[PDB]
Structures are given as structure tokens and as C-alpha cells.
Paper text:
pmcMenin, a 67 kDa protein encoded by the MEN1 (Multiple Endocrine Neoplasia 1) gene, is a chromatin adaptor protein that interacts with MLL1 (Mixed Lineage Leukemia 1, also known as KMT2A) to regulate the expression of multiple genes, including HOXA cluster genes. Menin has been identified as an essential oncogenic co-factor of MLL1 fusion proteins found in acute leukemia patients. MBM1 binds to the central cavity of menin, utilizing Phe9, Pro10, and Pro13 as energetic hotspots, which occupy well-defined hydrophobic pockets, and positively charged arginine residues (Arg8 and Arg12) that are involved in electrostatic interactions with the negatively charged binding site on menin. Importantly, recent clinical studies found emerging resistance to Revumenib treatment and patient relapse as a result of somatic mutations in MEN1, leading to point mutations of T349M, M327I/V, and G331R/D. Understanding how these mutations affect menin structure as well as the interaction with MLL1 and current menin inhibitors will be crucial in the development of a new generation of inhibitors maintaining their activity against menin mutants.
We also solved the crystal structures of these menin mutants, showing no structural changes in the MLL1 binding site on menin. We found that point mutations in menin do not change the protein structure and only minimally perturb menin residues surrounding the MBM1 binding site. In contrast to the predictions from computational studies, the crystal structures of the menin mutants revealed that these point mutations have no impact on menin structure or stability. We have also calculated the electrostatic potential for the wild-type, G331R, and G331D menin variants and found that in all cases the MBM1 site on menin has a strong negative charge that is minimally perturbed by either of the two G331 mutations. Point mutation G331D reduces the binding of the high-affinity MBM1 motif of MLL1 by 10-fold yet maintains the potent interaction with longer MLL1 fragments and shows a very slow rate of dissociation of MLL1. Surprisingly, we found virtually no activity of MLL1160 with the meninG331D mutant up to 200 nM, suggesting that this complex might be much more difficult to dissociate. Then, we performed competition experiments with the G331D variant and found that incubations of 24 h or longer are needed to observe dissociation of the meninG331D–MLL14-43 complex. A similar effect was observed for the competition with MLL146. These results demonstrate that meninG331D binds MLL1 with a similar affinity as wild-type menin, but this complex undergoes a very slow dissociation and longer residence time, most likely due to the additional negative charge in the binding site introduced by the G331D mutation. As expected, no activity is observed for the G331D variant due to slow dissociation of the meninG331D–MLL1 complex.
Residue numbers in the entry: 2 to 53, 74 to 386, 399 to 460, 549 to 588
Write the structure that this text describes.
């Protein structure tokens, strides 16, 4: 049951009323994840999915929210019998966690598009019987909280979600699917994936949420998009205000991606008196370095993308070099394709487009151009070095000749006289970690880049055409 004290702010008639409810729940011993997710999903439904009849804000009446809450708790209590799963020591069993995951999974519509917008919340679960992948994980944690299982918490990588539980919160369990066409591992640990040093499991440096961080997750999960060309200003404002609430309370300290999301929101619409976007992107990086061994990729991608948007070539290249310095110490494994796609798009689309415009601006007499800065050439080289080093030791390869054309083109955007300034030193100065780039060193300073030799050095190809 919802408690009396949780009910006093209703009806919620505005963004700020929603914020008050979040503040009240975050001041309680354990914020109520089910209440909060149902509220967010209700207002997201009426602000983004169906705005018919909207005049300011979709008033959330207690009768409506309480009935949805009861629909959830009735479903979970009825289908999960706790007597079947005795709890030693205030901690949950693997079988109980699996039962909860099965109850949520089995409730879902048989067939639907799993990557649609607005299927993240408990409101979607109850009203549409649809959840996205991490939405199932969140729903398992919200169900477990409603059942009194204080030890079950959300675990997050940069591309997946599962749960932690058990003695000292030291157990892991898969509770949802990952990607499209992968082998389901529900009920199993994540320890094989940690041991293979995949990006997917972050070498074990993934997020282990407390309840406050699970609130942060649902807030990050708000989706303001009405359509491909339009976002709800109301939802953007709500998300921004709730992220500052969390920030002020300390609950983003261990949440790099939330800090990046808030930076993105501040760039779109700055809040007077608050840190700049740049400051917030750097805080996200600092969070990753402090709490996650500097093993996260996206904090640097958040930063590079900001600099790219602002056509800051130098700082974008720096940030992408830093990204690649993280990825170098991973093995590229079979379910890591989302980060491969991101690196591919940066090397083979984004950087080319940035340097093409920089070349045109140099022709028109730009000063201080990244294309005349040997430190920028070094950043480009460090980016490729980290990708080559990533590939070393990996069960699946990364580079192929489709990368080589863009490498040759990007190298050629810097004149020989600029490229010659970088001194490549062994263990502007640069050290290579990869054997591919070490072998490419002499090719990098010729006036006219040897395209064929670069292709041979970047790829597995070792022969040239017969005839």
C-alpha cells in the first residue's frame, strides 16, 4: 500500500509539483520507485505520446495514480509467493530474483517493437504490457522493492542492465535481454563477461545503484521526443529540474552518464547560476575516473560531441583520443557492436566531415587551425592507436580496408610540414601502444601519403593484387 504521507502532494498539477514529489520521496528512507516511475510515465504519456486536450500540464490525480499502483502491486504479490523463497539474513536468493524476472517477462505483449520510445516506465508496463530491455531490469528492481527485498539493486553498464543482490550485494543476475539476436542469459551471473574484458561488462567497473541512483536512472530514462523533429519542452524542463535536484543531493556523484545528460540539457537551455555544459562534461569524466577506474567510454564521447557541435576541432580530437585511450585496454567481443558502431562513425564520418570544413576554412585563411597544429595531428594518431590496440588480443577483429580510405584521407588533411613536427618515441611527442601504428610511423611524415602502404599496415591484408 501507498502510505498516507506519500499521498499529501496530490493532485500534481505542474512540473514543479512533480519535482516536489521527487524531493519528498528522496527525503524518505527508501524512495518509492513504483510510485515515481508511474508518475513519470503518466506525465510522459500525456506530454509526448498523446497531447490531445493538453492545455498546460496533465494533472495527476491520486485516484488515477493509486489505481495504477494497485494494478502493479496486485500483479506482483499474486504471482510471486515469498514463502516459496525463504530469506536468510535480510538477503534475497537467486531463485527469487529469477522468479521476479520471469513474472515481468511473462506479462509482456507477445510481439512488439522493442526499441520504440516511451516503453521504459511502469506506466507502459501496466497500460500497454510493453517494456524495453532496461525497462524490464528497472521493473524487476521496483517489484523487488515493493516485495520488501531491500538488497536487490539495478546494475548498469554503458549498453546493458541487470541486478545485484544477495550477501553484501555481491551477487549478479541477468534479468533482461541484451540487443537483438543475442543468446539470453537470464538468471546467470555476469562473471564470464567481466572475465573476457568486453566493453559490455566494463571489466567489472559497472554501476551498482543504490535506491537514489535508481531514481536518477528513471529520470535519465525520461524521453521528451514527440516525433523525429519535436521534443516536449515540458518534459525537457521536468527532466532538467529533477536532475538538478538529484545533483544537489549528491546522487549523480557516481553517475557519469547522468552528468552528461544534464550537460546536454544545459546546452539546450541554460539554467541561470548553474555550471556550464563543459564543466558538467568534465564532472562526468571525473566521476568515471574516481569511481569506475576510468574504464567508461561515453564520458569522453559526451565531451567530444559537444566540441564537434561547436566546431572546436582541436578539443574534439583531444576528447576522441582520450576515448580511444580507454578502449585500448578492452577486448572487442561479440556483443560489443554498439561501441564499434560509435567508433566507426567517428573515424569514418564525423572526423572526415570536421576536417573537410577545416580544410575549406584554412584555404580561406583561418589562423590557429587544427590542421596547422601538430598536437592535433598527434590526437588523430592517438585515436587510431587506441583502436588498433583495442583490436590486439580480441576474439573478433576491428579494422578492415573500409577504415583505410578514411585514415588516408584524414592524414592528408594535414600538410607534411605539420605532420613532421610530431616525434614518435618508443618506450610534440607521442608514444604508440599498438604494433599497427608503430609500423606505420615512417609512412606518417611523407609529403604525399603512401595510400597502398597505409592500407597494408592498417589491415590483415599482406599481399597486393596479382596482375
Amino acid at each position: 500500500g501507498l502510505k498516507a504521507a506519500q499521498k499529501t502532494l496530490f493532485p500534481l498539477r505542474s512540473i514543479d509539483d512533480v519535482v516536489r514529489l521527487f524531493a519528498a520521496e528522496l527525503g524518505r528512507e527508501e524512495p518509492d520507485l513504483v510510485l515515481l516511475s508511474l508518475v513519470l510515465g503518466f506525465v510522459e504519456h500525456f506530454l509526448a505520446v498523446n497531447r490531445v486536450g493538453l492545455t498546460y500540464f496533465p494533472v495527476a490525480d491520486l485516484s488515477i495514480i493509486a489505481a495504477l499502483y494497485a494494478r502493479f502491486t496486485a500483479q506482483i504479490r499474486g504471482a510471486v509467493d515469498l514463502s516459496l523463497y525463504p530469506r536468510e539474513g535480510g538477503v534475497s536468493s537467486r531463485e527469487l530474483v529469477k522468479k521476479v524476472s520471469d513474472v515481468i517477462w511473462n506479462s509482456l505483449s507477445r510481439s512488439y517493437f522493442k526499441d520504440r520510445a516511451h516503453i521504459q516506465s511502469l506506466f507502459s508496463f501496466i497500460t500497454g504490457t510493453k517494456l524495453d530491455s532496461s525497462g524490464v531490469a528497472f521493473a524487476v528492481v521496483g517489484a523487488c522493492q515493493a516485495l520488501g527485498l531491500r538488497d536487490v539493486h539495478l546494475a548498469l553498464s554503458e549498453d546493458h542492465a541487470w541486478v545485484v543482490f544477495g550477501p553484501n550485494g555481491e551477487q549478479t543476475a541477468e534479468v533482461t535481454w541484451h540487443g537483438k539476436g543475442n543468446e539470453d542469459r537470464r538468471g546467470q551471473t555476469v562473471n564470464a563477461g567481466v572475465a573476457e574484458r568486453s566493453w559490455l561488462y566494463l571489466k567489472g567497473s559497472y554501476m551498482r545503484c543504490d535506491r537514489k541512483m535508481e531514481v536518477a536512472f528513471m529520470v535519465c530514462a525520461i524521453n521528451p521526443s514527440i516525433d523525429l523533429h519535436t521534443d516536449s519542452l515540458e518534459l525537457l524542463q521536468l527532466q532538467q529540474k529533477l536532475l538538478w535536484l538529484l545533483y544537489d543531493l549528491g546522487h549523480l556523484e557516481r553517475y557519469p552518464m547522468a552528468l552528461g545528460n544534464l550537460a546536454d540539457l544545459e546546452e539546450l537551455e541554460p539554467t541561470p547560476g548553474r555550471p556550464d555544459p563543459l564543466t558538467l562534461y568534465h564532472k562526468g569524466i571525473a566521476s568515471a575516473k574516481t569511481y569506475y577506474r576510468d574504464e567508461h567510454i561515453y564520458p569522453y564521447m559526451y565531451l567530444a560531441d559537444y566540441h564537434c557541435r561547436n566546431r572546436n576541432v582541436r578539443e574534439a580530437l583531444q576528447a576522441w583520443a582520450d576515448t580511444a585511450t580507454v578502449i585500448q585496454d578492452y577486448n572487442y567481443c561479440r556483443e560489443d557492436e554498439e561501441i564499434y558502431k560509435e567508433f566507426f562513425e567517428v573515424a569514418n564520418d564525423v572526423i572526415p566531415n570536421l576536417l573537410k570544413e577545416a580544410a575549406s576554412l584554412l584555404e580561406a585563411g583561418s589562423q590557429g587551425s587544427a590542421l596547422q597544429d601538430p598536437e592535433c595531428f598527434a590526437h588523430l594518431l592517438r585515436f587510431y592507436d587506441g583502436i588498433c590496440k583495442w583490436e590486439e588480443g580480441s576474439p573478433t577483429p576491428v579494422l578492415h580496408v573500409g577504415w583505410a580510405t578514411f585514415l588516408v584521407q584524414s592524414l592528408g588533411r594535414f600538410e607534411g610540414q605539420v605532420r613532421q613536427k610530431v616525434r614518435i618515441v618508443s618506450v610534440p611527442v607521442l608514444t604508440f601502444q599498438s604494433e599497427k601504428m608503430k609500423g606505420m610511423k615512417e609512412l606518417l611524415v611523407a609529403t604525399k601519403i603512401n595510400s597502398s602502404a597505409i592500407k597494408l599496415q592498417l589491415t590483415a591484408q599482406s599481399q597486393v593484387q596479382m596482375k
